[PDB]
Design a binder for this molecule. Structure first.
Ligand SMILES: N#Cc1cc(-c2cccc([C@@H]3COCCN3)c2)ccc1N
Lengths: 18, 353
């Protein structure tokens, strides 16, 4: 599912700028 | 047509009043922009309480003003580290913007000063912490809840863009929630006064507009793209474009395809397709009718824009109040000293601060 894909991305925490 | 006479006249009048407000707000901004405030407190006016965050060149600390007992969030930047990281102009610009703007959803700079070692920005303390934590905890916001926050961002961008400021770092991590449940925007490190186009690659991968990724000159429409990403993330619980690595995120952003959860209303999907529009000649916020294409969209039909501005709408969520000065909505960090050298560092570079 999309939610599971989001968890799998490893990008669920705070995101840094470029 | 879509509106009878009374409704059309009311809308027209409201839109003209916005123009009148923005013209006055620009006059006020330009006076402060041309003559910035400096040196309005000193370090020994404050007691340090707790570190709220720590990063590359600086820290944010909860402090208490010794005489009033009021709590503030003090950003501390090490001048030598700012120079080494090539952040002089961004640091001076962030302070210059903060002292010049005035809007109910932009954090206020209450004092600023510098000493031999550091620069200090003393801002309002916003005890609800970042939207990010609340969103990840609750999972997703219902559409009315997302809309309440979205409306505040629309008005804030309408204000900033009228001053020719592009914001460039919208994301839940940068939106704080106050004790009345309203948003406070804090970080102006990527903001720029831009009447036309600009070219810098900056922002956060999930929130970057296609034209930034494609190394184009770009304009304030990147902020309207980012609003689409934010609304999507608030309502879904995850952003529209994600992947394990940024390059795969960028491929999705430029593709012109976005998919929606089945619980999104048709009105929400229509708004998002018009904000997350790769073609700049078609993106809402970038057309002849400007911000009004967004404000007049069906998804916002229940939004009383003036009541939001006046903070008269009851918020859908009030962060748990645990006392003036509680820090529960911020993370815990090791407490480090605030060192002040006996010798002035980088004086010339920071004269304007
Ligand atoms: N209250 C308050 C207040 C808090 C912050 C702050 C405190 C901790 C962490 C962060 C990170 C800073 O960069 C990443 C996104 N948010 C910001 C910044 C400004 C403030 N006025």
């Amino acid at each position: 599912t999309t939610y599971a894909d989001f968890i799998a991305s490893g990008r669920t925490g705070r995101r840094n700028a470029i | 047509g879509h509106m009878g006479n009374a409704a059309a006249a009311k809308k027209g009048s409201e839109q003209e009043s916005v123009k009148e407000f923005l013209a006055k707000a620009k006059e006020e901004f330009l006076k402060k922009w041309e003559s910035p405030s400096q040196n309005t407190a000193q370090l020994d006016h404050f007691d340090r309480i707790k570190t709220l965050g720590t990063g590359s060149f600086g820290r944010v600390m909860l402090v208490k003003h010794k005489e009033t007992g009021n709590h503030y969030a003090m950003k501390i930047l090490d001048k030598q580290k700012v120079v080494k990281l090539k952040q002089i102009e961004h640091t001076l610009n962030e302070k210059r913007i903060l002292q010049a703007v005035n809007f109910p959803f932009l954090v206020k700079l209450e004092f600023s000063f510098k000493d031999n070692s550091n620069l200090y920005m003393v801002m309002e303390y916003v005890p609800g912490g970042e939207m990010f934590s609340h969103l990840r905890r609750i999972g997703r916001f219902s559409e009315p809840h997302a809309r309440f926050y979205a409306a505040q961002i629309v008005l804030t961008f309408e204000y900033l863009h009228s001053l020719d400021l592009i914001y460039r770092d919208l994301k839940p991590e940068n939106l704080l929630i106050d004790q009345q449940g309203y948003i406070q925007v804090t970080d102006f490190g990527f903001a720029k006064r831009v009447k036309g186009r600009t070219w810098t690659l900056c922002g956060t991968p999930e929130y970057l507009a296609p034209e930034i990724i494609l190394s184009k000159g770009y304009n304030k429409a990147v902020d309207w793209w980012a609003l689409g990403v934010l609304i999507y993330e608030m309502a879904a619980g995850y952003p529209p474009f994600f992947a394990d690595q940024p390059i795969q995120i960028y491929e999705k952003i430029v593709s012109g395809k976005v998919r929606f959860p089945s619980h999104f209303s048709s009105d929400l999907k229509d708004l998002l397709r018009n904000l997350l529009q790769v073609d700049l000649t078609k993106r809402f916020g970038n057309l002849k009718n400007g911000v009004n294409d967004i404000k007049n969209h069906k998804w916002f039909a229940t939004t009383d824009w003036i009541a939001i501005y006046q903070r008269k709408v009851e918020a859908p969520f009030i962060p748990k109040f645990k006392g003036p000065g509680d820090t529960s909505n911020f993370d815990d960090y090791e407490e480090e000293e605030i060192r002040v050298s006996i010798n002035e560092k980088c004086g010339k570079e920071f004269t304007e601060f």
